[PDB]
From a paper:
Here, we report a novel approach for the design of two dimensional protein lattices that we confirmed by X-ray crystallography to high resolution. The “polymer driven crystallization” method is based on the human TelSAM (Tel: Translocation Ets Leukemia, SAM: Sterile Alpha Motif) domain. The SAM domain of Tel (TelSAM) forms an oligomer with a 65 helical symmetry. However, mutating residue Valine-80 to glutamate (V80E) renders the oligomeric assembly pH dependent.
Here we utilized a tandem repeat of three TelSAM domains instead of two. In order to avoid aggregation by rapid self-assembly of the resulting construct, we selected the N-terminal domain of the ferric uptake regulator (FUR) protein from E. coli. A flexible linker was used to connect the n-FUR domain to TTT, in order to allow the n-FUR domain to sample many orientations and select a favorable position without restricting the orientation of the 2-fold axis. We determined the structure of the TTT-FUR fusion protein to 2.3 Å by X-ray crystallography. One molecule was found in the asymmetric unit, and all four protein domains (3 TelSAM domains, and 1 n-FUR domain) were identified by molecular replacement using Phaser. The loops that link these domains were disordered and not visible in the electron density. The identification of this mutation allowed us to place this molecule first in the sequence in accordance with the design, with the V80E TelSAM first in sequence, followed by two WT TelSAM molecules, and ending with the n-FUR domain. The organization of the 3TelSAM portion of the fusion achieved the expected structure, an oligomer with 180° degree rotation per unit that forms a 21 screw axis, which can also be described as one dimensional crystals or fibers. The 2-D layer is formed by TelSAM fibers that are interdigitated with the n-FUR domain. Importantly, within this 2-D lattice, the n-FUR domain is the sole contributor to the lateral contacts that connect the TelSAM oligomeric fibers.
Residue numbers in the entry:
A (entry chain A), B (entry chain A): 11 to 87, 98 to 174, 183 to 258, 271 to 351
The structure:
């Protein structure tokens, strides 16, 4: 029992950006609210539907909770461009940029500059909602919610950097920055961005990361926060294979200090010496199934002389 | 009852490229075949399994049928890099190139030069098996079969060019070439590649297309061959909507010579004059559902004054 004009009585999914603005103006007068600036929700009705109640309160502290609930009352009676149908973990930097361009058209947002998110989908997924708001004051909340919706519809370090950040040296910090530039497709990260060790890097606030690095500081800080939060029978199961005696034994021989690298025939000869009763072609099949399941690597040599190496 | 050595008695899926070669040499001697050059199948066993019987006969006219059937006798007792999980219709030119690089690693092929297929996935899908062989004498048949397998696991012209090729002028031929360069991501197609009309273009063999255009002639010829081969109740159904009287009428008013572009209120007023009994908010909802279903386009104007245009 709230009377909107005819073109606002349809489903909000249909409301243009002007319809959104006429709705706000209608509500302000209907409910004696504080003035609602015509710029408070620069989007269409489809975009407004993606916003959380918290996003309403954030855009309109005087009236947002009220507008959200007015919207639920009104309600009580997504396919992307071809290259973007992948899980966002796989979007390239170019994809992210095409995602922005699609989104700005789909949702009538204010112009999203093409350097707003210069990073790949993996990096995008590291950012917080706060970081989307910061990069995009007009549309960051819609964009973040857009992404969460795309996720409903559906990172390990280099070896030289797998020790706690607290022990990193200046040099490690430097290798981290250039590892992260490549992994996350970020703008160039000049070698002097963070001239310090891990202990000092751990003292910086996210605002320090942003100042040192306008293009990538938020990604880098959340990467750091991520990094800080993050029996042969089972060995076989864990790699996808049924336990058999021929598998256990061969696996056993490969775990000998001498037999890490071993060819099929030597493995066989080694099995016999131990008094095991296993056939030659069986040794070949096991080690190749082991290869396929990541337990060993086959290194080829002509005529049944490949050497198998336990990974 | 064919006795291979131990490492060739495993499943062919496991055979390296050398194992393939030792198998051929074994077969040649076991079956008194003509000499089989060690270069006849430069691939691993996984690749050999993708080849058709026809590919066997083509690689070995003296012995291929025989090798294929030996292989079926032996048998009688695919996940791509992340960016390539899309239907191949969507692969970019860069994807195609990454597809080649993955394939050459996966299958131990001879080196596939990165300019072997300079075109996008749509273009790749136009090529015949013969064109894959021509572009890649060592691996083209495997690659084509690889693609068919990826498809089991799962183009309209610009308006100025939708008339039969037989009527194309020189100028049209020229617009076709640059439309196709953009659509298929081909190398630059110099304006002098085909200085002639559609009737003459239709006289050229595929070999003429290849000579005029080493980078793209086969794509262009198959594009040409593709092009040459290729009631309101139903109007509503065809666009995804249940027939209702309010829909039929509005659709009817929009098909008037005067009302192609019409706003909701005028449509309403026009319905009344005809003695129709339909409410104003209903006119709004229909035209917006029509918009969403491609029957009209909504052109926005502030305050319920959008003009709707029949597409």
């Amino acid at each position: 029992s709230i009377r909107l004009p005819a073109h606002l009585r349809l489903q909000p999914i249909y409301w243009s950006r002007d319809d959104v603005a006429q709705w706000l103006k209608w509500a302000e007068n209907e409910f004696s609210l504080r003035p609602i600036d015509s710029n408070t929700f620069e989007m269409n009705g489809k975009a407004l539907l993606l916003l959380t109640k918290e996003d309403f309160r954030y855009r309109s502290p005087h009236s947002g909770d009220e507008l959200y609930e007015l919207l639920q009352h009104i309600l009580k009676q997504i396919r992307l461009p071809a290259h973007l149908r992948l899980q966002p973990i796989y979007w390239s930097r170019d994809d992210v940029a095409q995602w922005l361009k699609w989104a700005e058209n789909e949702f009538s947002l204010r112009p999203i500059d093409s350097n707003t998110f210069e990073m790949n989908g993996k990096a995008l997924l590291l950012l917080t909602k706060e970081d989307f708001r910061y990069r995009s004051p007009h549309s960051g909340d819609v964009l973040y919610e857009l992404l969460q919706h795309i996720l409903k519809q559906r990172i390990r370090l280099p070896a030289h950097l797998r020790l706690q950040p607290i022990y990193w040296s200046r040099d490690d910090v430097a290798q981290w920055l250039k590892w992260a530039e490549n992994e996350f497709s970020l703008r160039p990260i000049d070698s002097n961005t963070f001239e310090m060790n891990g202990k000092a890097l751990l003292l910086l606030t996210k605002e320090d990361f942003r100042y040192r690095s306008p293009h990538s500081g938020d990604v880098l800080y959340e990467l750091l926060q991520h990094i800080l939060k993050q029996d042969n029978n089972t060995a076989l199961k864990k790699a996808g294979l049924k336990v058999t005696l021929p598998r256990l034994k061969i696996l056993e021989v490969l775990q000998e200090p001498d037999n890490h690298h071993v060819s099929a025939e030597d493995l066989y000869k080694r099995l016999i010496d131990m008094g095991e009763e296993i056939g030659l072609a069986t040794v070949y099949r096991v080690l190749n199934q082991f290869d396929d399941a990541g337990i060993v690597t086959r290194h080829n040599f002509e005529g049944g002389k490949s050497v198998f190496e336990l990974t």
